[PDB]
Amino acid sequence: KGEELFTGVVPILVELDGDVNGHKFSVSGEGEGDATYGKLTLKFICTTGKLPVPWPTLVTTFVQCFSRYPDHMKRHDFFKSAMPEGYVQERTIFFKDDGNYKTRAEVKFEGDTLVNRIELKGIDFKEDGNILGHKLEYNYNSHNVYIMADKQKNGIKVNFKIRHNIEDGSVQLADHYQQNTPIGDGPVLLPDNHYLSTQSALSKDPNEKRDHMVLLEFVTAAGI
Numbered sequence: 001k002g003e004e005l006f007t008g009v010v011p012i013l014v015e016l017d018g019d020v021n022g023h024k025f026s027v028s029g030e031g032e033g034d035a036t037y038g039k040l041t042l043k044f045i046c047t048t049g050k051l052p053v054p055w056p057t058l059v060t061t062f063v064q065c066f067s068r069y070p071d072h073m074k075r076h077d078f079f080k081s082a083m084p085e086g087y088v089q090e091r092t093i094f095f096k097d098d099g100n101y102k103t104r105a106e107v108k109f110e111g112d113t114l115v116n117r118i119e120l121k122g123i124d125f126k127e128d129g130n131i132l133g134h135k136l137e138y139n140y141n142s143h144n145v146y147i148m149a150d151k152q153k154n155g156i157k158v159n160f161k162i163r164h165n166i167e168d169g170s171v172q173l174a175d176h177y178q179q180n181t182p183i184g185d186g187p188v189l190l191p192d193n194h195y196l197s198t199q200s201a202l203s204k205d206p207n208e209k210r211d212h213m214v215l216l217e218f219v220t221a222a223g224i
Contacts, residue, residue, distance in 0.1 A: 012066075035065070038066065056137075063114060075189060086183040090180075149190045
């Protein structure tokens, strides 16, 4: 019964603390989310200074409860269903032939603000690599996210790959593995497999002098 929660535009707050190959950094993200349209709008700041890794790489990490679930599919909205209480999102993201990322985040409401708090741990990155070497283009493609229920952990398992465009026209693969679990002891909706169609556009704020990333994104469920 989290749907009444996402009836209008909801403020979003994003906080991440990370360490990549001994590279410590932090980001703060503020924005709005309008589930009715599967639309998200945020701005991220690298508070500790210059971001050690590349922006496009943090996107997946930086609130699926803002996805638009068509009417005929609401019974599958696990995300909104964990609402108010929230849920845990954990991930292992393997960058092909490079390091991998480990994440644990908590997705919940604090008052009337939607909060995503994350701790990220990065290891085995090559300094002479795409990531560390900053060789990714500042852009992003559309992707499908497959969702299947994890009846066991009373949650869901998600799989998907992201392709990051390399500056030489090449592509860097990012294999994502993710599990979600409700924070409460309340009931949630366990869905049948389906997927989320995600579009994203990264931009920059001219008048913004700090290290950041502006983000616009739309997400709609389908495959059902």
